[PDB]
Structure formats: structure tokens, C-alpha cells
Design a protein around this ligand. Structure first.
Ligand SMILES: Nc1c(NC(=O)CCC2CCCC2)ccc(NCc2ccc(C(F)(F)F)cc2)c1F
Lengths: 143, 359, 359, 359, 359, 143, 143, 143
């Protein structure tokens, strides 16, 4: 619908501070750096090319829209999630204890607060056991 | 009740589908059981031992069919442990798997052979070939994953050009040497009465078999056979060595890579990013956890969605790169990155204590 | 018209000359076709099956000769896609290639055999050997590149000394063991009636053949045969393992190197330099593009020519070095260069904050 | 007296238990001696040579039994050199070792055979099989460590999946090809009178034996045998190449690692830490050496105990990590650590000459 | 005169002693010549072809003896090119070499056989075995370096334990399987009339020979032979694969190391140091070159001698270390040294801009 | 007995300067750094996790007590000692000269004074020969 | 002819600023560095030896003349060009799109302006399609 | 004779500036550094252990005398010389041109003046051809 396109246009305007119409590496670094998340410019610039359909070194509005429509269902992330919870399953039972989730969330990757892992256990620990199965959570992705 | 129920379900699924330690023992036993059956069937085909072995063969046949049926039922039940197959439709989908259908066809064929071919215990002559073929297919099914076939195919493809070269040269020398031996000993030797006998002899020779039914007897044929044997027995045995060496190299690399820590960390990054993605969905009137977390770290909602998806997709890519660890590529990439970082450092110090020198 | 014409030309050239995916299928079919022909010719040589197979053999012979002719014409036409062979002289040069001449000799020999040897489909006795040799040479030609032969030769040369050692030892033990067995069983055994029978038996033995026509029967001859069999069967089978292992190692290295990015970048540098060279030619009253570009970057004309050629030749050298990437040499050279750079850095900082300490 | 006594004890223990250089010669001699015995026993089993070889066989039997007994006594005496086995109970524990019990059972069995079976040197018919089995077990015992068996088992386990695949495919093709050849030549050929003859022939074939007792004679059976021979002889010979390649790779890695200096230094650290641990025991009213040393380096006593044990256990861990040196893991870990150190350096310089820029 | 004389001397020495390119051709020709001789002698041993081949055999014998004599003379003359063997005593020492003495014994034995055994051209019956043995030894001598033997011995020693394990297991299974087959088919089968026939059959089997003279016929013997064949044919063929793989690995490493520049530079350092040593001899009243050079770089004379010898011996050690380049040890040592240098750098910067911070 | 537990409590109090009840990496670095032994913080922090049973990044009193009870007999240090004296035995005789002990002690690992190696030779050189056997010393460990 | 030799002498004089008669590494670095192209001294010095026939560490007039006569036809550059356009042919069709030429020229090697790639497409894109064949261009080299 | 021993004692005194009786790494660095040759301390210290018979980290008078008696004939330097001139023989003829000696001497190892290589060619170029044989020179060593 036109509502989502208008929201994407507003997002691009909030991104295109220079108004160039193609959010550039330095500009997209600035937009989120001011908020409070300050990733190194290397990650931003090397990510731009991964989504730059036309390969212009920036992101134009079509490249914004195409991914904005692209949800979790695409990009076959299912296999990546399977591997991701299989690596941390030292037993191979297909399930992982909640406390291990707390620890791995806290001490690896982009660290998040106890609130984030709290909502994580809320969603995943549907049966309230702690030993949450991987398959159910990954099904929740597409669902 | 449900706790122990699910514990047993997962234990049975692990034993049957993914056996690691003690589970293999059970599998081995079944294999041995199945193996024994053919042996008994083997021993039953001989008339002088059929009367002594048929009763044990029939008893073992009942035992093995019962075991296969109960194993199939237990497996299709334990398929509920994994969330891919749960409920009526889940179990149906599990049954859709090719090896599950193979199992049920095996069971029904065994039932049919035992009902029709066995007016008593001993079996019908026509049903005997079907029974033997059924045992062959059971042995085929013994492994459900087919990991052996996949490994063999992957190794063959890795050496596809090269096995092809070996086979092509072997076939060429076989044809050519057979042709000349047929020429030299067309009439002198009855063994090579025809070119086809020469081809059979050449195959028996190049494979290092040496049955002795056919062999050159003339000086010229013997000389040519000697030369092309020296040339081509190595080519014929080459694929065996090719495969063996390649297999050892593959397992050696697999052992080399085993560490997998740089694969561990990107997994954590990617899963945290995926949870952020799910928690930042705009259409969902929930997940205030990540919403307020980001509100601490700051049009606005859509911008947060966009940045979160950027970082999640890039983290997915990063985990993908760490999916395959190679020591050589690890060292190359790590040293390139470290060298670039070092270059940045030295540029900083240069310009910077240049600023100092200015003062 | 011309667009589709050239598209078809390049597609046919790719399918015939450089097949990668689906094209191989067609090649395989032709091979199978050709293969079937010999088999039918095979089945036609036997009298009891000649009357039943000769008609199909003749039909397949017409089919294969027609297919080979049309393939040759299509290939010599599609050779126009590449600019090496275009026009009358270009197609003539393409025909000059050794495998093209092999193809035309094959076609003419097939025509001659079908005309003379086949008075009525049935083939003449004299023309039969020529037909079989023609099929053998067609099978030889099946691969146009000869990449299998080149690979085998390269691997053999890589192990030339070492295959030589294996062969030399094998031959020595064969001669020596044959000599002693001939001594021990000169009269006792009619099998070794002569030294030559002993040599034939020793070759049959050391190759793991074991025909059974000849074999020692005396205690001493049997003992010596046992000892030297243990010694030399391993030597005789050695070249097979040598080649197999070496083949696997070669493919493993090829897989290791595959990345090729440091080969990509110098290609760009070299091609840009080559275009600069062409654009800076003094005798050419054109190419004002690079001329004015350099005029922005500045006797004069010749000096610019000289500097451009310096950089172009050095870039050619650099691309040549990147032409062969080896992980081991990559790491060694990269670390040496980085260490030298680091040394330069530290000398800079030392002298430099020494200047600072002076102040 | 005691000095030379212990010198001889350790020298004998080294020669018998852990032979490196000249000691092997002696072992070889014994092996040859033992080998000769069976050969003489071999030559004694033949009637035409029994009268000529039995006296030498008996003399060598007395010699070998005496040698084995004296060797056992010397070994159980020299076991005192190592402190694991000293005194009455120590020697008893040494005798408890499985190969020591094997040696004594060998000695007693030899005594029994020589007493009962030899009513007159020449041996009894019933005792002959026992004597031959005793020689077989002596040859088994020739190596006390069993290092050959351990190495073979380790290599097999390293390739367990993969040897399993090879064996499984080989067995499948053997069964299937045997079945079809039995079908094709059930009545036409008396060789394959039964399926079991077909299985025996298929095993003889796939192993490259080619006895010649059985072989296909029909066109269809010969064709099927040809195809599945080509398919499966490579599979049957595969385990040999697998093992050979893997063995060579293992020895190559062992040669690669040999340097072992980073294994040397942590050994020194750990042993110093262990001596500190023993010297810092609180319950011991001695060891004032390390006590006063620490008193120079400074509730108090227990705290010193605690810190010393922390450092000793961590040094034990560190030595454990250096216990297995791998070049690839060495480079990876060393470069990661150096890169982290370099990062620390550059952060220092950045913040630090930022402080300078502030001034 | 002397210039061309020495040029020819060195060229002949290179061709005969160290052939690289075209020289091998000549060697090959001689080998072929020698090869032909035995073949002709071979063809001369058969009576039906002796009258037709003896004249050519005798002519080739004269040709080969003349060629060997002239080659020996040319080689012992060209030995003057190298300064190890020059003058009467130098040529005598060159003749002292074992292969030179082998050559002269070959020549004298050929002369003796041609004089006594050949009343004319035809050769004496007794001299025939001596002639054949002489040809065998000539073929042995074909290679003067013995590099093949040295390479084989080195590779065997590299795998000494492991070849030993393979041989030990193979021998054990051979003995044991032969014993049981002899038990099972002592009377039923005349083939295994004796244990020794069983041993011969087992050796023929485990080596994949399959002569067919002996083979099990009973169910039990056939079963045991099947099992232990499966077990031990792989073990018997193992040494071949072991050696082949190891050979390929060795040549692969040799190819890997080839670069050799860090071996080049220390050679220059060491040779300069050695020339300094010779130029700084105190007892020599000459060599004022290095004396005055050092006088520019400055009890005194002896001190200069001492320092020069320190640096020369350490440079010799350094060149020794560079004598063996290994990529793995190269990277390890280079990275350790670079890391230590980097540590020194960072300590410098730390203490140094600490001095700055103090100001 | 309660005496050892009281001594461990006193040790922990002397360690828990902050009084947190779980001696932390920085705190355990400080406690021994002041004494005169100043190991790099890396060694301390990476050692803590090796003994941190609960994985809290620190050492709590239970983790103190469990190892305080754990003596040389546990942790199967015997094999480590066997390897340690086997590496320095260039002959393989099973015995090492005392002078080599002096040298290796002085120039490797945590260096100690001649007094430490003096008590070492006192204990090991029971028969007073210099060529001390490894097996006897390692037996002394458990004894 | 003498005209080319005179031009080479003028070039050498414009190179031999010091008048040494053998343009040295530092001098040849200076001569082109002043113009506006400032390659690192490493590239210059390591290139000198590649053309230094006498191995003097510099370039003398004979070494200048020998290469001045040496054109593209020599040095068998044909194979290098074949490899160079084969690497950038992701399809193997033997032809490469013009836009890929724009990109590779701009973002790799010694970068040139759109004018350089413009004359490049002028010469190579003889038939005006964009998918220019490699073989024709490499033939143009010798031609 | 006593003359050589007295000369060695004088040398040691000129080396033992501190008078310790065992020339130490720093002292032997100082003694030759003052003269005009200033090798990095690493080379000196790592060389000391190679000759330190007693392994004291220094050189005592016995270790001085033992090597002072040790001439070129010992230490089987012959093989090292063979390898050294074989590496620089790109042809394998067993002889090397004098100009290559000039170049390798000048541009590798411890560089020496044209005077050093002049005496080198004097000694080696006995027959005055330039293509000096390796075997004769290495024989001159022992001679
Ligand atoms: N062991 C073996 C070998 N030899 C080896 O693997 C050597 C190493 C092993 C491990 C330790 C002892 C020996 C070679 C080929 C086959 N063929 C597969 C096979 C065919 C037929 C049957 C059956 F007929 F007996 F069932 C069983 C299986 C095989 F088994």
C-alpha cells in the first residue's frame, strides 16, 4: 500500500540528511551514530555493497524498498538459525538451557540487557522448562 | 508424565536417527541379526543343509520382520520430538521421507513373501529371488542418512576430471591391447577364438585377476600383453589410490579445522541480531523490551527497524563467512586485516607526531 | 539478424569447444553413440550374432558418420565467434589445428570404409581391421583439448625421478627372480622350459595376475618366488599409488588456491597501464584523451611515453607474479613485506620522538 | 658395587623394555632365532625332511626356551631400575602386566610340550598343533608395547566412518554381482552350481585373486562380472590405499611438529610451580626455603598457599596446552595473541599522544 | 689449446657424471644398447632362434664392451676437471670409487667371457650364466649415483616403524590363516597335502596372485580363507600405498621449499666471513688488504683475529640454519622474531612517551 | 574440621578487600600484586575462569573451599610431571643430573633463587648422586 | 633513424638532471614526482633492476634505447592480456560488458578519469554493443 | 708454545675490561663496538652460547684457547663452503665468474671494499681467467 511507501520515504528523508537521494556510507554512519550506537565505519561501508543492487557505493530508494519488503521469510535464514543453535548445543539434543542463553547473549555478539533476554525467554520458553527447543523457535520466525 | 514421555521420545529419536555412542551397538545388533538372516537363507539354499537350517531361518525371519515393524513404529512415534514432524500432518510428512517409504515397502514385501512364498516355513522357489532381493535392499537401507553415498559422490566430484582421465586411459589401453592380442592369437590359441574372448582376457588381466581360462601363448601376443599390462594395470588400479588418498586428505582437513571458535562467536552475534529483528517488528503491538532498549539508545520507529535489519542481515552474512573455517584462508584474511589496521595505525602516528613536530 | 547469428555462433562454439554444464550431456550422448557403434561392431564380429546385429550396426554407422560430419561443419563455422579464426584465412587456420585434421581424416576414412568395404552394408574382411582402428582413433579424438594427456604428463614429470626409481627397482627384481627360478626349475618343471617362460611367469607374478599357466613347483624355486614376490609386488604396484597420491595432492592444491583476488587486482592495474601505453603512442595523431590527462599531471612527449612504458612493463611483471598464487609463498612474501614496512615505521618513530626528546 | 649394579640394571631395562639403537639388534637376533625355530619345525613337519631336521629343531627349541626364561628373569630383575616396580610387591606388580603373564604362560606351555609331547625329542602328534600355536603366540608377543596395534587402531578410528563406507560399498557390490552371476550361470556352468560358489568366486574376483577354479563362461554372466569387477575391485582395494595414505600423513605431521621448544619452556614453569607447591605446604614443619623466599616477596600463610596453588594449577594447564603442538594451531593462536597485543599498543599510543595533543 | 681442452673436459664430466638435459639422451642410448644386448642374449638362449640371433648378439657384445671401455677411459680422464681428482694420485683416488671399481670388474669379466666362453662367437654353456649375471650387474651399475637406492632407503626409514607394523601384521595373518586352512583341508584336498603347500597358497593369496594350483574346496577352509583374505590382502598391499603416498609427500615438500633466497644471502655472508678469516691470518706475512681495512675500522692483531673468527663461525652457523628451509619453520621462527622485535618497539614507545608525559 | 574452614574464611577476607564475597579478577590481582609478585592481569583473569565453577567471572567461597581441599593427589598431575621430567631427559634413562636442574630452574619458568633449588636437591637427591630419578620424586608427590 | 636517437638523448637529458649519464633511482623518482605522479620510491627502485641490463642499479642510455625500440609486439604481452581479460570474464564467453570496464577501470589499479575509459570504449567498442570481445582488442595491440 | 698462550692472555686482558676473567656479552660487545664495527647485541649474545662450553653465558679463558687452537681445518667447514659456492653457481659447472664474485661480495652479507674482493680474486684467480673453480679455493682453506 501507499502507507508503507510513504513511511519508507520518511525514513529515507531522515537518512538522506544531505538530501542526495542515495544514503551514502558516511551519512548512514552519521544517522545512527548520533542515536547512541556507534559502529565502526568499516562495518557500515562493507555492508553497503552487500545490499547495493546497482553497486553505486550507496543505497538508493529502490534498494531501500526492496529490502523493506524483504522479511525474515526470504534470504533462507532458516539454515543460518539451524546452524546457530546447533553450534551452541553441546549435547545435540536439539534443545538449549535458558541459562546458557543468558550467558551467550550477555558475553558474545552485540550484548543486550537482561530485558532483551527476558523477552527472549518469554517467546522461546513457551512450555516454561528452560531447555527450549530450537525447531519451535525457528518455526516462529516464518510464523 | 509429559517430562518422562518427552525424555523417552528424544532418547529413542537420538538412538534411531542420530546414533553416536551406545546406540550404534543396537544398530550393529540389528545389522548382525539381518546379516545372520541372509546367511541362514544362504545356508538354506543348499539342499544338503536346507533341512537343517530352514527352521532357524524362518524363526529369524519372524524375529527380523517383527523387529523392523516395531522399529518403524517407534521411529515414526519419536519423530514427534523434533518440531518439524509433530501431530497427524507432521507424522505424515515424516513418513513422506524416501527412506521411510523404503522401510514400509520392505515390511509389506516381507509380509507378502512370508504369506505367499511360505506355504509353511520353507519358502517358494519363485519367492526365493524376491526374498534375496528384499534382503539386499534391507542391507542398502541399513544406513538411513546415506552419508556414505554422499561422501563418495563428493569425493568423486572433487576428482571428477581426474578419475575421468584415469578411466579414459584405462579403457583405451584395454581396447587396444585386446585388439592386438586378438590379431596375434586368432587361430593359434583357442582361448582367443574371438575378439570378445580377447576383451574378456584383457579385462581380467588389467584388473590383476588372472583367472587362467585365457592367456597368450605366442611370443608376439605374450610380448604385447606384457607391455600393455605394465602400462595399464597401474591405470586400472589408479582410481583406488586416487580415492584413498583423497579420502585421507579430506579427513585430514576436517581434523585440522575442528577448533571452531570463530564460528561460535558470529553465531552469538547473529542470534542476538535475529532476536532484535523479531523484537523490533513494527506491526507487532508487543516486544516493548527491545523497543524501550532502543529508545534508550536514541520516522523514528521505521528508522530503528531499518538499522536493525541492516545489522541483522550483515551479521547473517558474517556468520555465513565463519560457517566455513579454513586454516589457510583464516591466516590469509586475518593477516590482510591486521596489516590494514597496522597501516591505519602508522598513518595516524605519522600525521599525528607531525602535528607535534609542528609545535 | 546479426545479433542472433552471433549469439548462436558463440553458443555452439561454447558447447563444442569448451563445454561446462549441459553441453557435456550432448558430448556424452555422442560418446555413447560412438561407444554403441563399436559394441554393435563388436556384436557384429561374432558369426552367430552378425546376422542379427549387422543391420543396426550399419544404421548406427550412417548415423555416426553424418553426426561427425555435421559436427565438424558446425564447429568450423562457430570458430568465427573467436577473432583468432575469422574469414576464409581464419577458418583455414582453424582447420590447420591437429585435431581438426584428425577429424577430417576420420571422416574420409569412414567414407572409404563404407564405400569399399561395404558392398552391401555387410563389411569386407580387410576393411574390418581398418574400421576397428578408426573407431579406436575416434575414441582417442573424443576429447579435443587432450587435457587428460597433459595432466598425466605433468604429474609424471613432477615425479619423474621417483617413478624412474620405482620402475628401475621393479625391472631389476623381475629380471633377477626370473633368472633364479629358471635356474631352479629348468628341467623339473616344463612350465619354465626356457628362461623366457620364466620371464613371462615373473611378469605375471609381480603384477599380481597369477594366470596359473606357469608357477614354481620345487621347494627352492617356490621359496625364491615367495621372497622376491614379497619384495617386488609392492614395487610394481608402487607407480599406481605414486600417481594416485600425487593426483590427489595436485587437486588439493588447486582447490586451496582457488580464491584469486590478488590475481584480480593486478589484472586491472595491468590493463589500465596497457591502455595508457596505447593512448600515449607518439606516432599516433589521436588519443588526445590520455594526452590531455597527462598534460594535467605535469622532450615532454617522449618523457611521458618513457614513464608510461616503465609503469606498464612493471605492472605487467606484477601481474605475472600474481599469475601464480600459492598460499605458502603468499604468506611468506606478505609477512616479509609487512615486516619491512614495520621496520620502517619503528625507525621513523625512534628518530622522530628522538627529535622530540631533543626539544 | 651399588653404582655398577644399578648401571647394569638400567642398561638391561633399556635394552629389553625400550630399545633404541644397538638393543634392537639383540631383539632381532631373538626374533630370527624364534623365526628359525618355526622354520625348523616347519621343515620337521615334512616326513622326507623330518629325520634330517628334527635334531636341529630340538636343539633350537632348548636354546629358545632357555633364552626366553633367562630373558624373563633378567627383565623382572631390571624392573627394579624404575621406581614403579621395586621390592617384592613392586616386582609382583610388574609381573601383573598382561605381557609378563603372556611370557610365563608361554614358558610353561613350552615346558609342558617338551615334557609330554617329546617322549624322545621329536614331538607327539597331538602336541604338534599346540607347539605351532605356541610359536604363533610367541611371534605375537615379540613386541611388548603393542605399539603397532595401537597405531593401527588409532589410524582406523581416524578413518572409521570412511573405512566403513568403503567396506559397506564393497560388500554390497559383492553380494549383488554374485547374485546376478548365480542367476545367469546356474545351470550352464558347473562352477556356479550354487549361489555359494558364486559368492566365493565374487570374493576371489573383487580381491584381484583370480584362482581360476570358478569363472563365468556365458556372455551375460561375463558382462555382469566385467561391469561389477570394474566397479568394485577399486572399492575392495580402497582400504589399503586409505590406510597407506593416512599412515603417511600421520608420520608427516609427526615429523612436522618435532621441534618442541614451546613444549620445553612450560615444562620448566610447571615443575618450578610444583616444587613451590610442595615447599609451601602448611602442615609441613620444614621447607623454610620457599617460606622465607616468599616472606621476602611480601592469614598470611594460607594466603601464600592459595596464591601458590593458583599459579601451580594454571601452570599445569599451560603445560597441558603446550603438550600438543600443532603448526597450524600454533600460528593461529600466536597471531591472535600478537594481534590483541598490537591492539593494546595502538590504543595506548592513541589515548596517550592525545593527552600530548591536549598539551 | 688449454682453454678448449678444459672446456671439453668439463663438458664430458658433466655429460657422464651429472647429466641434466641432452646428456641423458646419450645415457638412455647406452641403456637401450645394453638393454638390447640382453634381449639378443635372451633371443640367443632359445635354440630355434639362436642361429638367427647369435651373430647380432656377438656384434652388439663387441660394440657394448668397446663403448664401456671408452666411456671408462673418457670418464677417468674428465675427472681432472674437478680439483678433487687431478694428476696421477688424483686419478687413482677417482678410480678408488666403488662404482669405478665396479666398472673395471665389469670390463674384465666381459673380456674373460668373450675370450674363454666364446671359442668363436657362440658362447660356452658355463659362461652363459656368468654373462647373464654380468648383464644384471651392468644394469645395476647403469646409475652411478645410486640416488634411487638412497631415496628408497630414506623414505623407508621415514616410515620404518610403520612399514614394520604393516609387515608384522601381514606375516601374522599369513601364518595363522595358512595354519587353519591346513587344518581344515589336510586330507580332503590334495592341494594342501602339507602345511607348506598351505603357506605357499596363503602367500599366493594374500598377494592377490591367485595362481590356481592350490585353493580351498571345503566350506570351512573356504570361509576362513575368505575372512583372512579380506583381512590381510589390504595389509599386504599396504606397503605399496605407504611408499607411494610418502614419495608423493616428499616430492611435494621439495617442490614447496624450492624458492631458496634466505639460503642465498647467508651463503654470501659466510663466504665473506671465510675470506676475512683467511685474510686475517697472523702467521701470514701477506693479505694487507683486510689488515688495512680493519685498521680503518679500529694485542690488536690477535684481538682482530679473535673477533673475525667469532663472526666467521657464527656466520657459518647461520648459513647452516638456512641450509634447510621449511615453510612451516620459516613462518614460525620469523613470526617469533618479529613479535619479539615488536615487543621491543612497544617497550621503547611506552617508556619514551612516558618520559614525554613527565615533561 | 572447622579449623580449616575458619582459615579459609580468613583467607577470603584477606582476599575480599572490597568485601563483595566473591574475589574478583582485579581484586585478586591487587592482593598479590601488593605483596611483591606482579603477574600480568591477563594471566589472573584467564585463570579465574579455569576454576570458576559457577562461571561468574570471580571466585566465591565454595570455589575457594573445593580447591583448598583439592591437593596434589587430585587433578591427575602425575602424568603432567611424567611428561615434564621426560622432556628434559635428553637420554631417556629416567634420571636427570642435578646441575641440569639448577640450570633449567634458573633460566626458565618462574625463576627461583639458589635456595629453592637447594631444597629441591635436598628432597630429590635422596641417595646423593646428582642423577636423580623422576619416578621417585613423582611418587613423593602423592606421598 | 637519427631522429629517434636524438629524441631519446633529449629524454635522457631531461631525466639525467644530475648529468651522471645513468638515470638513478632517486633521480628517476624525482623527474616524474615533480610532474604530479608520485609513486612510492619502492616501486621505482625495484623496477630499475628489472630493466637494468648491466645491473648497475640505474638505467644507462643503451638500456633506454633498447626498450624505446621494444614495443608492445615484444615481451609476449599477448598472453598477459589474455589472462587479464579472462579473469574479469565471469561468464567465459570471451566478451565483457562496457559497464564492467567502467567499474574495473575506476575502482582498481591506477585509476583513470571517465575520459580514459571513454577512449577505451571508443577503440574497443568497434561494433558499438558494449559486450566487447577480448580477442579483437588484443589483436589491435600488435596491429 | 707459551708464546701463543701469552698472546691469548693479552687478548683476553684487552677483552676483559672489567677484569672479571670471563668476557661477558656486554663487554665483548663494547670491545669491538668501540673499534668501529657495531653489531647488534643480539648477534653477540646469541653467539656466546654457541661457543660457551661451560654454558656460563660468557667466554672464559679455556673457551678462548680451545677455539684459538681450532683453525679452519676443524669444524668441517668444507661442506659449508661447498654449499656456499654451489648455491651461487647458476650453471653447476663448478666454477663462478669473478664479476659475480664482485657483485655478491658487494651487495650481500657483511659488505667489503673493492680491496677485499681484489685480494680475493688474487688468491682464487690463480690461472687468471675469471671463471674460478670452487674446489681449488676450498682446498686452499685446509692448505
Ligand atoms: N576388512 C575388509 C578389507 N580389509 C581391511 O579393511 C583391512 C583393515 C581391517 C580393519 C582391521 C582388520 C582388517 C578389505 C575389503 C573388505 N570388503 C568389504 C566386505 C566384503 C565382504 C564381507 C562379507 F562377505 F564377509 F560379509 C564383509 C565386508 C573388507 F571387509
Amino acid at each position: 500500500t501507499e502507507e508503507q511507501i510513504a513511511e519508507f520515504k520518511e525514513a529515507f528523508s531522515l537518512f538522506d540528511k544531505d538530501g542526495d537521494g542515495t544514503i551514502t556510507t558516511k551519512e548512514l554512519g552519521t544517522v545512527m551514530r548520533s542515536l547512541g550506537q556507534n559502529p565502526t565505519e568499516a562495518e557500515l561501508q562493507d555492508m553497503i555493497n552487500e545490499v547495493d543492487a546497482d553497486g553505486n557505493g550507496t543505497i538508493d530508494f529502490p534498494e531501500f524498498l526492496t529490502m523493506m519488503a524483504r522479511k525474515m521469510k526470504d534470504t533462507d535464514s532458516e539454515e543460518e538459525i539451524r546452524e546457530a543453535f546447533r553450534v551452541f548445543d553441546k549435547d545435540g539434543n536439539g534443545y538449549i538451557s535458558a541459562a546458557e542463553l543468558r550467558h551467550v547473549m550477555t558475553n558474545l555478539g552485540e550484548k543486550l540487557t537482561d530485558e532483551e533476554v527476558d523477552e527472549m525467554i518469554r517467546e522461546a520458553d513457551i512450555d516454561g522448562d528452560g531447555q527450549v527447543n530450537y525447531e519451535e523457535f525457528v518455526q516462529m520466525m516464518t510464523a | 508424565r509429559n517430562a518422562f514421555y518427552r525424555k523417552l521420545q528424544n532418547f529413542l529419536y537420538n538412538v534411531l536417527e542420530r546414533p553416536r555412542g551406545w546406540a550404534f551397538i543396537y544398530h550393529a545388533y540389528v545389522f548382525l541379526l539381518v546379516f545372520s538372516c541372509l546367511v541362514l537363507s544362504v545356508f538354506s539354499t543348499i539342499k544338503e543343509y536346507e533341512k537343517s537350517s530352514e527352521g532357524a531361518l524362518y524363526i529369524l525371519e519372524i524375529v527380523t520382520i517383527v523387529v523392523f515393524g516395531v522399529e518403524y513404529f517407534v521411529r515414526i512415534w519419536a519423530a514427534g520430538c523434533c518440531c518439524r514432524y509433530r501431530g497427524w500432518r507432521g507424522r505424515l510428512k515424516f513418513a513422506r521421507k524416501p527412506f521411510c517409504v523404503i522401510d514400509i515397502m520392505v515390511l509389506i514385501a516381507s509380509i507378502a513373501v512370508l504369506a505367499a512364498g511360505s506355504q509353511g516355513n520353507v519358502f517358494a522357489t519363485s519367492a526365493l529371488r524376491s526374498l534375496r532381493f528384499l534382503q539386499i535392499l534391507r542391507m542398502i537401507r541399513m544406513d538411513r542418512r546415506g552419508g556414505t553415498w554422499k561422501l563418495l559422490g563428493s569425493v568423486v566430484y572433487a576428482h571428477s576430471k581426474e578419475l575421468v582421465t584415469a578411466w579414459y586411459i584405462g579403457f583405451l589401453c584395454l581396447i587396444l591391447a585386446s585388439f592386438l592380442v586378438y590379431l596375434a592369437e586368432k587361430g593359434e590359441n583357442d582361448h582367443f577364438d574371438t575378439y570378445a574372448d580377447a576383451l574378456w582376457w584383457g579385462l581380467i588381466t588389467l584388473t590383476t585377476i588372472g583367472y587362467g581360462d585365457k592367456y597368450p601363448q605366442t611370443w608376439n601376443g605374450r610380448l604385447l600383453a606384457a607391455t600393455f599390462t605394465l602400462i595399464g594395470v597401474s591405470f586400472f588400479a589408479l582410481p583406488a589410490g586416487i580415492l584413498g588418498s583423497g579420502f585421507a586428505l579430506k579427513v585430514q582437513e576436517q581434523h585440522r579445522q575442528k577448533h571452531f571458535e570463530k564460528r561460535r562467536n558470529p553465531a552469538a552475534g547473529l542470534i542476538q541480531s535475529a532476536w532484535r529483528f523479531y523484537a523490533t517488528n513494527l506491526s507487532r503491538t508487543d516486544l516493548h523490551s527491545t523497543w524501550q532498549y532502543y529508545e534508550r539508545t536514541v520516522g523514528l520507529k521505521v528508522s530503528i527497524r531499518a538499522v536493525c535489519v541492516m545489522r541483522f542481515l550483515v551479521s547473517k552474512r558474517k556468520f555465513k563467512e565463519s560457517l566455513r573455517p579454513y586454516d589457510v584462508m583464516d591466516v590469509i584474511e586475518q593477516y590482510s586485516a591486521g596489516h590494514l589496521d597496522m597501516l591505519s595505525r602508522i598513518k595516524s602516528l605519522q600525521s599525528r607526531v607531525d602535528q607535534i613536530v609542528g609545535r
